[PDB]
Amino acid sequence: ASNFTQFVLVDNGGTGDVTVAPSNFANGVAEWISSNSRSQAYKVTCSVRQSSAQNRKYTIKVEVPKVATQTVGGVELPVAAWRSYLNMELTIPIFATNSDCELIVKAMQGLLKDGNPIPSAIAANSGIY
Amino acid sequence: ASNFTQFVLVDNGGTGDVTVAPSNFANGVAEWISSNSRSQAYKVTCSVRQSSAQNRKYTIKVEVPKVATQTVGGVELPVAAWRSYLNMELTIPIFATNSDCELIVKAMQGLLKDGNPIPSAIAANSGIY
Amino acid sequence: ASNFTQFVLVDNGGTGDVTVAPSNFANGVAEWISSNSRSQAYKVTCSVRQSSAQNRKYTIKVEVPKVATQTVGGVELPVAAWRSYLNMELTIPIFATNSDCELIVKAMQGLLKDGNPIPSAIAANSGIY
Amino acid sequence: ASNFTQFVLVDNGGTGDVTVAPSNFANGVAEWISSNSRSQAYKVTCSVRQSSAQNRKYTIKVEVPKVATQTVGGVELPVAAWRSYLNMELTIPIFATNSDCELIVKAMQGLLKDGNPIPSAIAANSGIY
Amino acid sequence: ASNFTQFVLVDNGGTGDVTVAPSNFANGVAEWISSNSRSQAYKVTCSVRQSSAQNRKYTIKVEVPKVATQTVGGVELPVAAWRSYLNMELTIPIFATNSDCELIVKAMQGLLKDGNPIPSAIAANSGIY
Amino acid sequence: ASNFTQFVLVDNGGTGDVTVAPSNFANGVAEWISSNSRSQAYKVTCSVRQSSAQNRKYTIKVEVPKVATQTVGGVELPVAAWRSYLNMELTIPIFATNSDCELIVKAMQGLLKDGNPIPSAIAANSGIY
């Protein structure tokens, strides 16, 4: 069941979607990027390992470009002003079954579902109030 | 209106859904828990801070328990056999607009969407290949 | 093309086969893991290195679990009651051609072929008699 | 009955097979040797012992020669230009039944089956890619 | 689709072409080798890394052998009389777009094109004058 | 057989080609540049020397400008953000004949030919996957 394929990272109803495609598999770490320069592209990486005696850990990283007023193909500096970073670590005990892992995935999806508090706060440049 | 509201963490289609409700805001950490004992409850936390002069950082954590009943000294107690921990750190430059932040939210949602590589690998107890 | 793919480790006809899938390639050691709980999964690893100026060495390891349920204090967990460990080291001189390597592989396959003395002894909990 | 018998180590169809025959059983180590000159012969050894209170350990070794003629000072001798060495160690707990042992053997056979990643890498003078 | 595929390293017009095929990806170094013994094979390697915060570096190496048969201790062995080594280091800023990278590739191709000064000098065992 | 002449570094089908012409021969090092400012020009250099007792080494360097969003004739800073560098070293044993050197040139051409893995990865801002 090979799964290292391109997917839609940002869905805009079919027009203007952001697709990321496989770009690197060095050291077993899967990497996806959008069709941009490295400084302006969406980037996804994912790897999993045995973190401890009784846990496995997925390490998932995402880079998102700032798009308002950007210059496509231009040199934008400083780098830290134009990019957002997501660092996500999922620790799962070795006892978890496929059913348990499906539940964990549902928890993450529900956490980030549109209309829920956490995505609402992020989208509104706000905290919890 | 306040964004500190209850939400469905695990959507099972209306029956057996896991709901978490606001439970604490002490020390600037927003907390949600399911309607269980503290030993067996699901848990969600979220905080935001000015990590540096030009970036803001969200710190989001989720705990998924595997519930069980443990006999301690001849008495049965509600415990969690183990817990799965999700840790998300999201750094956003102060220059990001609301539309830029909406892109970040859509990227995360698309990352975890059903059928996409990363959730499929997690649900299947496997890496990406 | 790529040989870091899913494969059938235990061929139980067509139904009930044990399949292992790539999970990790850290430090140049490829790792395959079967699905469901990691505590009960099969494990295969393989690495190759230049052991001397004239020799290359393959290191291959396989773990076969005995699946069981552990119950301690009323808490049930899926575990391996015990595991069987295979450690293989194969040294091949740099002078060997593709034809020579194919012959070496045939030797290993013939060593473990059904009806032959060594697989028969292993399958019968027996030595050589 | 007896498993200390002649067997086909390399199966080259029906003509040109490499057959090894019992030669020695000293110190509880069974040894098979192919025919013709010993300097060029294939070698297989196998022994089993109680490695710990709960484990039995098989030690299996195979030598594959590259046949050649050595000429020193006009004197010709049949030799092996070099040899490939396989060393296998298999540990099986005393609790394993005959069914469990048959499963372990199937795992080894499936590991080395044609088309699978590890035999393919060996036959192609290659690693995992 | 994966870009880790076999390719014709030396094009002789369809007869006598030298083909290299994927052979290893351990430690993040992609390797190709020809269908020969390791002592006589052609070799290609390629890796990419973030050399600094704003540049990426490709490291590409090729080995071209001059094959021969060497008598060592009265036994003939396949060796390389000597090897020619090509080492390429290519540094690209993160701000380069795909079109910018295509220009880099075209520049290298035009540099080595038949009839151009540098390949002519190399083929003629001479410098540029 | 003088060979220090202008050549087409980037071929765009006859219209828009990038030609580089001789611009310096100090210290015996041949240099070509395009018709631009030094900060925005294509630049090629080549020299050859006796690197060791049994090897000669060609040192070939190429500089390629970033063209997307450039400003022709403008001051573009920092320099490292607008230019890509190729450093290529070809080591050839003194025993190699003209025929051997022609084969080496073919190897380089095949390495960089359109549609092959290495140029494909570079053009797509990607590694090997």
Residue numbers in the entry:
A (entry chain B), B (entry chain A), C (entry chain C), D (entry chain C), E (entry chain A), F (entry chain B): 1 to 129
What do the authors say?
To prevent this, we describe a method to encapsulate target proteins within highly hydrophilic, structurally homogeneous, and stable protein shells, which we refer to as “nanocrates” for this purpose. Our approach was inspired by the established use of natural virus capsids and engineered protein containers for packaging applications. We adapted this concept for cryo-EM by encapsulating target proteins within symmetric MS2 bacteriophage-derived “nanocrates”. Being highly symmetric, the nanocrates do not adopt a preferred orientation at the AWI, and therefore their enveloped cargoes are randomly oriented. Nanocrate densities can be computationally subtracted during single-particle cryo-EM analysis to allow for high-resolution reconstruction of the molecules inside.
